[PDB]
A paper describes a structure:
In un-soaked EV-F3 virions, the I site is partially occupied by a ligand similar to GSH and to clarify the nature of the binding we performed two further structure determinations, firstly with CG (the GSH breakdown product) and secondly a competition soak with equal concentrations of both GSH and CG. We then determine high-resolution structures of complexes of GSH and its initial breakdown product Cys-Gly (CG) bound to EV-F3 and by a competition binding study demonstrate that GSH binds more strongly. The CG portion of GSH anchors the two adjacent protomers via not only these salt bridges, but also by additional H-bonding interactions with Y231 of protomer A and the carbonyl oxygen of W154 of protomer B via a bridging water molecule. Although the carboxylate group of the E residue of GSH makes no direct contacts with the I site, other portions of the residue contact D150 (protomer B) and, indirectly, R227 (protomer A) at the inter-protomer interface. Given that for GSH the strongest interactions are formed by the C-terminus of the ECG tripeptide, the binding of CG is not unexpected, the preference for GSH, however, confirms that additional binding energy is contributed by residue E, although its side chain can assume multiple conformations. We find that the binding site of both compounds is identical to that for a similar molecule that remains naturally attached to the virus, and to the binding site observed for the benzene-sulfonamide derivative in complex with Coxsackievirus B38, identifying the biological role for this binding site.
Enteroviruses are responsible for a range of animal and human diseases. These non-enveloped viruses are constructed of an icosahedral protein capsid composed of 60 copies each of viral proteins [name]–4. [name]–3 are similar to each other (comprising a β-barrel with extended surface loops and termini) and form the capsid surface. Here we study EV-F3, a relatively benign bovine enterovirus which is our model system of choice. We firstly show that EV-F3 is dependent on GSH and that GSH stabilises the capsid.
Numbering used by the authors:
A (entry chain D), H (entry chain D), I (entry chain D): 22 to 69
B (entry chain C), F (entry chain C): 1 to 243
C (entry chain B): 1 to 244
D (entry chain A), E (entry chain A): 4 to 274
G (entry chain C): 1 to 49
The structure:
């Protein structure tokens, strides 16, 4: 996988010159998968 | 000058390289980042969203009708309703789904799959169906008895219109190839199995009611799903440059 | 009990301004991208004039002309803010200002009976282009309050798969389950504000994916009604009224 | 106004061992797609599971990993020693389809230029020649000929290289007047005009043109040029429904209607 | 479950001085190969030895030292300006035989590409030309021609270089879907098929193909390409019996039967 | 830019070079390393494992028979049973052994060698044999008296079926070349000596028993053994590319 | 020599580049900066007139 | 032999880019040479 | 915009060799826009 240690010095003035971002994480997808006002717990029925 | 020795690779243009380079506008200051809803940081957020499977991909079904699984009042028991290979990246009903498109942008996949079904008959229309996942090894199950020996869920039509059958990740290896192309790579090796649906009882309706109804089929990746090795989506092509 | 048992109650009341909408067969409420409408921040704003915030005069429910769920119904759509550009004070504020920003509360209505079956996809799509024609007709890109009928539902009028429209804020009106859909939408754009007469930020589509069928002899005339309320709106660049 | 949190993860979710469940209380399998929410049934609730400490990463699907590589955006040959290319990514479909997966996005770009000399029969030549690529922003005068004064390029940025040197390469910042580029625009390019040709295009996405020439005249041959673009430092908003029909035009998303996406099979009951 | 330890050493074993031994107790020389264990008789127990502080290292026989160098894996000439090479290491026997010394192994690889132009008579030309090597993973569309759209390579990784530049070179990680590559597989490629042609090959070892082209058309000449591979960061398991017969096929280990490995001598009593 | 001066070697492709280079898939995350038995870190672990010597490499012996050293009831005393040069990397009986194969992948070797022999006659078959190692200087010993002056072991057939003769590392230099090729390099310089076996007494059997029996010969490197300078194994070759 | 790998862009002449380069007159010492009225540091100062 | 001191900085993001490993030791070969359950000491007879 | 951190070492003897200046600010334009002796406040009439 990715190296825990490696050179990370910027040689140029503008950030546009920098190499690619190295975060690459993901986030809870709820804003897309469950964009609802009322919480609907997994163990209960959705509608009542 | 500092003594140096340049090496192989020098001057090459690797499309996936990642170097720093001079900026055309070194002092340029971009517009501020404003608050915009819906920021996405990883496409795994997208494949986890359910989308419709083009499940009824037969000659007689055109357009929107291809999303509907036909259900009808039976006069025999234990009959089959549908069948499908669960592999998300192969040609077929899954290829046009959100999950399918992104899976087709990669060479390998892993993870459980969420197959959700919504019954769309009348409020008075009842029924029970069994949906089963058959791990690989043989051919798709030939009858309900064989199918029920695998992972499955029995769905009872009612107020809660939908049911979910989780096709758990059950694989020899941590990942599977996204194609089952055999002639060249013999990737049939990776087949993930089948999902089949059968009448558990029967679809039952009152007098003069529609004796046919539809089920919509949704699919999405589960939270333990991931993809590796980006590749060009085979569905996007062109002859000459567009004008 | 709903918040205690972890379920969503099927009844709902939406009250904005002098208008109240109720339903006894809802399926929760969707809040687009999990974001409620919000005012423009001082750090995001660029237009320097003090904005007009009409309040209740424009932030209320406007009901549009109903559409019939015919046998050959392919679906119907409305552009926002286009659909309300000539309705009430929301329309007037939209016309008198160069810039507009705002969210929405959409309530789609369609009741039948326990003897009917059918399913409508109710989706709010950001930047939904009607591009099935080489040269799109203004009558179809901006159909006004009457909305326009779908001609290419399978391809979502834009060359994508109808089945993937679920990536956008949506709900379904499945007759056996519910008779209405409710969506709260925040302002979305690559800009802080924009012209309400040159750009439609959202498009509301109501598309039948499971055709309307029913026990023989049941009521055959089933309308679909859309009621929309602007929410958290502000306008800049006042001048004479101008429409597209 | 955000009522739904978005915590970050660096690995996919683990699986926890589960046991049987026989009750009238918890019913994870029952769902209601009408709500607009994707099922929340977990693996552990649908079957008996084992413990799986899953260390699979999520890096290759990040926006940076997905978009962070070069793709062809322009390809042409000079005519009279010059070529004018309007900067737009609609000519070559692969990168185009990728970008349209997002509604709005901010990113810097790395442009790489690969050029070589070809003859009248389009046969490549081993001939080193100096070439100039000048970025002409909208409003600036575009040179009509290979030797026009605009090539002085005292303000316009230019990159001069040689077909005998490695490909030229420069980075560009996020240049739009907007706060993000738009890959879907349901509006018109101007007030007072509702012609179809001015629909679906946001002018702020067009930053100008690249004009290319050989510094001196080639004798009977031409300069072949390929321009590649690589998005960097990507920030994106509002995922879109993927393109599902062939592209037909460079500037519009017009398409040919279809009655199916995937190919047909004999019957729905045979996988 | 490991009952046998594996302490590490950086030098071979020393020799310690020993003296005579006349006893009925210790009998180091007596062994029993039937147990499956290699003799444990030490030098010091078989003869009188002296002290030898042996500083001989063991580095050159480590997996990294043995495998850590480039070897030819592909060699071909374009036809119509293009060539499709299925990634596999069975064509050239030297590296192949080395890899088969292990049953399972994980390693990254460094690929080096050396290319030059040759004419119809296979005579090398001093001609600098740009070439493109595109990695096409299984499932992605493989270009049919030198100018097909797939060369846009917006997602597939590609490396573009020139025969006038040093050899191209890129590293690749351990890419198998498995937890190690397998250099011996006693099984079939799929369920439901027991044909001999689908035996002895583990599909996960095949990661795709490399398609090569010259960016523009050569006039009557072709591109000659050699691909070298160098394993790096090697981890290996289960040593295997070395190949002792010539290879005959690229995809199978089929061989010609033989009645001897070494050549014969006149008699067993004459060295 | 920092002033630099590039040097000779620039652009060259040394197959044994060791530089860092851009990765084709910079964000790729490999499958986890799982617990697999038999990990090997150095091939010295392999050459220390005993393997059979193809000792009876004569015209009359084919296949499996080539591993058997013939023994038979004698009617004369002090007779010879076998002979072999101890050099592990030269053509001959040792070339197909584990030790031989790896030694043939290198140019130099050092270390003591383990030669183990297992008697395979009947339980009632007895005998004593002497196995000797003759350090270099002359030709192989012509008789038992000459052979016994060198390093040796007297083996008594019995319950413990095997015996080990350690050929200790006795060399002028710390290493020896693995080939004794003379015509070009004059490497005969490195000859390590001979191993010979003789009847110490006689093979003796009861009435009607097989009067011939076999001895299997094993060889392996000792713990002070090492190899230097990797080279291509001469046994692996091909004409054209394999299809 | 330190191992290096030169990259795309090498040898190119980007008119807006910003590198350090050898001076034709390394020991040259310019005339002093004197007090002159009207110094301007940014043209925004001009367009505001 | 190997240098006791020398540059060891990674310039790239992925470990696959790193130069060769520099350990190169060997381990006790017992798992291959003497994979037996009962210990058989060098000074004793193997079987009894 | 510009990087908050980046290499800033001069390799040459003369300042003329140095890369471009990285300040780039602007100053109050009064010396050009309002070069008058008497202050004329925004809220008052200019002349009296
Ligand atoms: C002097 C060297 C020339 C290098 C090229 C500079 C190019 C500058 C233009 C940058 C604009 C890129 C963003 C375009 C995104 C919109 C794409 C589209 O909608 O078609
Ligand atoms: C874009 C530059 C191209 C560089 C080459 C990339 C190659 C990617 C494939 C890597 C797979 C290597 C492992 C193969 C091991 C299995 C060998 C075999 O059994 O035949
Ligand atoms: Cl397929
Ligand atoms: Cl198939
Ligand atoms: Cl030899
Ligand atoms: Cl010899
Ligand atoms: K107000
Ligand atoms: K985890
Ligand atoms: K539930
Ligand atoms: K789910
Ligand atoms: K030692
Ligand atoms: K012993
Ligand atoms: K031993």
């Amino acid at each position: 996988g990715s190296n825990i240690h490696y050179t990370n010095i910027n040689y140029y003035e503008n950030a546009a010159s920098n190499s690619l971002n190295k975060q690459d994480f993901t986030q809870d997808p709820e804003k897309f998968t469950r964009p609802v006002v009322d919480v609907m717990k997994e163990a209960a029925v959705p509608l009542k | 000058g500092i003594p140096t020795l340049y090496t192989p690779g020098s001057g090459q243009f690797l499309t996936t390289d990642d170097f720093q380079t001079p900026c055309m506008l070194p002092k340029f200051q971009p517009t501020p980042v404003i608050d915009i809803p819906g920021e996405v940081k990883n496409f795994l957020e997208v494949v986890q969203v359910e989308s419709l499977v083009e499940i009824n991909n037969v000659e007689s079904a055109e357009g929107v009708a291809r999303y509907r699984i036909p259900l009808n009042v039976q006069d025999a028991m234990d009959g089959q309703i549908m069948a499908l290979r669960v592999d998300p990246g192969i040609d077929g009903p899954m290829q046009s789904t959100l999950l399918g498109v992104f899976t087709r942008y990669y060479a390998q996949w892993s993870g459980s799959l969420d197959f959700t079904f919504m019954f769309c008959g009348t409020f008075m229309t009842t029924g029970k169906v069994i949906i089963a996942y058959t791990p690989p090894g043989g051919d798709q199950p030939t009858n309900r008895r064989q199918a029920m020996l695998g992972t499955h869920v029995v769905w009872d039509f009612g107020l809660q219109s939908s049911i979910t059958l989780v096709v758990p990740w059950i694989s020899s290896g941590h990942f599977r190839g996204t194609t089952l192309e055999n002639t060249i790579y013999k990737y049939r090796y990776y087949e993930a199995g089948y999902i089949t649906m059968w009448y558990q009882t029967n679809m039952v309706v009152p007098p003069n009611f529609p004796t046919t109804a539809s089920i919509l089929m949704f699919v999405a990746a589960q939270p333990n799903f991931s993809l590796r090795i980006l590749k060009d989506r085979p569905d996007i092509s062109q002859e000459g440059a567009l004008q | 009990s709903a918040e205690a048992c972890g379920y969503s109650d099927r009844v709902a009341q939406l009250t904005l301004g002098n208008s109240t909408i109720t339903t006894q067969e809802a399926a929760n409420i969707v809040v687009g991208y999990g974001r409620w409408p919000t005012s423009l921040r001082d750090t995001d704003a660029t237009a320097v004039d003090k904005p007009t915030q009409p309040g209740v005069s424009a932030e209320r429910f406007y009901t549009l002309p109903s559409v019939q769920w015919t046998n050959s119904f392919k679906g119907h759509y409305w552009k926002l803010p286009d659909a309300l550009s000539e309705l009430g004070l929301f329309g007037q504020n939209l016309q008198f200002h160069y810039l507009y920003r705002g969210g929405w509360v959409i309530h789609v209505q369609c009741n039948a009976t326990k003897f009917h079956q059918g399913t409508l996809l109710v989706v709010a799509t950001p930047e939904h282009k009607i591009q099935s024609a080489e040269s799109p007709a203004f009558a179809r890109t901006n159909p006004g309050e009457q909305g326009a009928a779908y001609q290419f539902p399978f391809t979502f009028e834009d060359g994508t798969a109808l089945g993937n429209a679920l990536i956008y804020p949506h709900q379904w009106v499945n007759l056996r389950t519910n008779n209405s859909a409710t969506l709260v939408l925040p302002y979305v754009n690559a800009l802080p504000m924009d012209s309400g007469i040159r750009h439609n930020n959202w498009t509301l589509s109501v598309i039948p994916i499971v055709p309307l069928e029913y026990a023989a002899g049941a009521t055959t005339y089933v309308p679909i009604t859309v009621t929309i309320a602007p929410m958290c709106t502000e306008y800049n660049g006042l001048r004479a009224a101008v429409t597209q | 106004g955000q009522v739904i949190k978005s915590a970050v993860r660096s690995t996919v979710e683990n699986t926890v061992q589960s046991t049987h469940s026989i009750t009238t209380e918890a019913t994870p399998a029952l769902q209601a797609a009408e709500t607009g929410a994707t099922s929340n049934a977990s693996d552990e609730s649908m079957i008996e599971t084992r413990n799986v400490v899953n260390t699979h990463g999520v890096a290759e699907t990040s926006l940076e990993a997905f978009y962070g590589r070069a793709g062809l955006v322009a390809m042409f040959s000079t005519d009279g020693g010059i070529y004018r290319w309007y900067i737009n990514f609609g000519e070559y479909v692969q990168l185009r389809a990728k970008l349209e997966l997002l509604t709005y996005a901010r990113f810097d770009m790395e442009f790489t230029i690969v050029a070589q000399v070809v003859n009248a029969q389009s046969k490549v030549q081993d001939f080193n020649v100096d070439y100039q690529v000048m970025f002409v922003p909208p409003g600036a005068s575009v040179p009509e000929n290979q030797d026009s004064y605009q090539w002085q390029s005292s303000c316009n940025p230019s990159v001069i290289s040689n077909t005998g040197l490695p490909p030229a390469r420069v980075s560009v910042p996020f240049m739009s007047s907007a706060n993000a580029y738009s890959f879907s625009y349901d509006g018109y390019t101007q007030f007072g005009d509702t012609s179809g040709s001015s629909y679906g295009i946001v002018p702020s996405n067009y930053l100008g043109m690249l004009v290319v020439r050989t510094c001196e005249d080639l004798d009977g041959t031409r300069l072949r040029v390929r321009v590649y673009a690589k998005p960097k430092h990507v920030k994106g908003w509002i995922p879109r429904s993927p393109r599902m029909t062939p592209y037909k035009s460079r500037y519009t998303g017009v398409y040919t209607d279809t009655t199916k996406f995937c190919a047909n099979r004999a019957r729905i009951t045979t996988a």
